[PDB]
Amino acid sequence: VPVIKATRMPHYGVPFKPKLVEQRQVDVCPFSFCDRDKERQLQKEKRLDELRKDEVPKFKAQPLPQFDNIRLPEKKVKMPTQQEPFDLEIEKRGASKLQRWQQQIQEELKQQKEMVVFKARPNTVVHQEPFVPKKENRSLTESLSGSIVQEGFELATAKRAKERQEFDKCLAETEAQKSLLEEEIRKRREEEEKEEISQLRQELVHKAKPIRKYRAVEVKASDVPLTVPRSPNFSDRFKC
């Protein structure tokens, strides 16, 4: 079944892709934060803190950490990922490709910027990708709580000033609802065109190795562009 409820261990090197992340439905997919971060733990946790560069998000992206979140040790990629563009969290490849990473995990979301920002300070680990509270969304204090200094959905420092009255206290949690869901799901409620944008419009997101990322045929997925698995140490494409 396409369910997260993933075991803790290296993200890209934890159960990868049964198919879809936990639900595959904005109504029964918590990346909400009334009190459902607890299941969501899995997604948030893995790359953030210690791997504090640019959150490879709490995946509302492709399935439970399949390729996403921390780094991939050479002794953990015992089993291969199923279907993905990149499994570039990969110490070789990936972490190097990590600059290129920014395009796919970002671009499926309209907003994008220098992610090897939003984790280099106190709670700036809540960009519209890692977005949840608790110890991280302490607000947007005074000197260095990490306002999202980068923009989070809106929630960068200075991008408080005009917005503050309707913004923070009232809209910020509802802001959070549109946030994370908007990223990779990119749907909100209607318009499936918003989804499958990662491949289709311009986003020559990863020119890596030709990926039949051409999900326009086995559109039966989720949050991930139906991408053929990236090849590891085989020159021949993983297809054959």
Q: For 125-151, give the DSSP string.
A: --SSSS---TTS-----SSSS---SS-
Question: CA–CA separation, 156 vs 27, rounded Å?
Answer: 27
- What are 67-70's contacts with CB under 8 Å, separation 24+? 67/11, 67/12, 67/16, 67/94, 68/11, 68/12, 68/105, 69/10, 69/11, 69/12, 69/43, 69/45, 70/10, 70/11, 70/12, 70/46
For 188, phi then psi, to 5°, come to 75, -65
State the residue for tokens 């890596």. 208
Question: CA–CA separation, 155 vs 127, rounded Å?
Answer: 8
Question: CA–CA separation, 183 vs 109, rounded Å?
Answer: 4
Experiment type: NMR
- At 4, the amino acid letter reads I
Chain-centre distance for alpha carbon 222: 13
Question: CA–CA separation, 53 vs 47, rounded Å?
Answer: 8
State the residue for tokens 């971060």. 37
The 3-state DSSP class for residue 188 equals strand
Both structure tokens of 239: 């297809």
Both structure tokens of 168: 């923070």
Question: CA–CA separation, 10 vs 225, rounded Å?
Answer: 22
Question: CA–CA separation, 34 vs 183, rounded Å?
Answer: 19
3-state helix, strand, coil in the chain (%, to 5): 25, 0, 75
Question: CA–CA separation, 38 vs 80, rounded Å?
Answer: 28
- At 142, the amino acid letter reads E
DSSP string, 45-113: HTTSSTT-SS---SSSSSSTTSS-SS-B-TTTTTS--SS-S----BTTHHHHHHHHHIIIIIHTSS---
